Amino acid sequence: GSEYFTLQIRGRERFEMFRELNEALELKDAQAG
Amino acid sequence: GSEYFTLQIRGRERFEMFRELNEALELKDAQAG
Amino acid sequence: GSEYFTLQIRGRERFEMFRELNEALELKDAQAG
Amino acid sequence: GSEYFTLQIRGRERFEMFRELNEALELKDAQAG
């Protein structure tokens, strides 16, 4: 989409694992000045 | 059925990457029925 | 290496999480697909 | 310190995917630094 993409994840543990990865990538995005 | 959750993802490359991982895990789920 | 590439992972939980993803990718390739 | 493990990965694009995910998680690593 123009502001984000969506993905449907089956299962709470699985979702929490993918959210940890996604938040970490967003932390990586912040490293550039 | 199972509980599903929405992962909101920034960037097309990042989306394609997560979709690849999620599809592989779903094919693993499919083994058992 | 010529048969695989290796990555050092810090922490048991982190390793287990990546191993599950990696094995799922391999199972998808082996079942072709 | 921590305990370290080795992830064995097939394919160089798959290796670079895991490398990137791991590097992002490593921005979280610290003793309250």
Author numbering:
A (entry chain B), B (entry chain D), C (entry chain C), D (entry chain A): 324 to 356
Q: How does the study describe this entry?
A:
The four domains include a central core DNA-binding domain, an N-terminal transcriptional activation domain, a tetramerization domain (TD) located just C-terminal to the DNA-binding domain, and a C-terminal regulatory domain that is controlled through numerous post-translational modifications.
The formation of the p53 tetrameric structure requires a short TD region, which is located between residues 324 and 356 in the sequence of human p53 (HU-p53TD). The structure of HU-p53TD has been determined by both NMR spectroscopy and X-ray crystallography, and it consists of four monomers that each contain a single β-strand (residues 326–333) followed by a single α-helix (335–356), which are separated by a tight turn of Gly334. After screening a variety of different conditions, crystals were obtained for the HU-p53TD that diffracted to a resolution of 1.1 Å, for the TS-p53TD that diffracted to a resolution of 1.17 Å, and for the OP-p53TD that diffracted to a resolution of 1.35 Å. In contrast, in the HU-p53TD, the side chain of Q354 from one monomer forms a hydrogen bond with the second Q354 of the adjacent monomer in the dimers in the HU-p53TD; however, the two L350 residues from the adjacent monomers remain more distant from each other than the corresponding residues in the TS-p53TD (4.5 versus 8.2 Å).
